[PDB]
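Example 5.3 — Peptidyl-prolyl cis-trans isomerase A
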Amino acid sequence: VNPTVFFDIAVDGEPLGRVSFELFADKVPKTAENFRALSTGEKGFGYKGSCFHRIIPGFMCQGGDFTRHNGTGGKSIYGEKFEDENFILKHTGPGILSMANAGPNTNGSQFFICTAKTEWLDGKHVVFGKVKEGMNIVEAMERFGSRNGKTSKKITIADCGQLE
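Solution (predicted structure tokens):
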């Protein structure tokens, strides 16, 4: 019953591949629903065409700022940054999908995909999904990041939506 969504990734406009995610609506419904709705674009805005603006190899790939494209923007589907739903799920290794934020109860649209275990983030960032297929595509993306997070090529969500 948990929804599956996909991102089709491009690198400087060239197709790279598809990453799919299981979203844990059973455990974090409000947080899963935000991401799913942003991924389909059914509210009139969302992830399609946005970039991964911060990528640090061995740590994580961050995206979801579809409004300012640099980590200063993004918005939820709810009309105003939302609460940390719960911290049931932990940052237990590569593939974990988690909400970026600006402190307690400030969730918008930005997220990260872990490429390692990042337990120091437990209790600070709401984990709400996990890569189901295409972790190799995330690994290929990661190689275009750098120590300070700046990417050396433009990493884009060329298309996205819900699978079934």
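Remark. The domain at 1-164 is CATH 2.40.100.10 (Cyclophilin).
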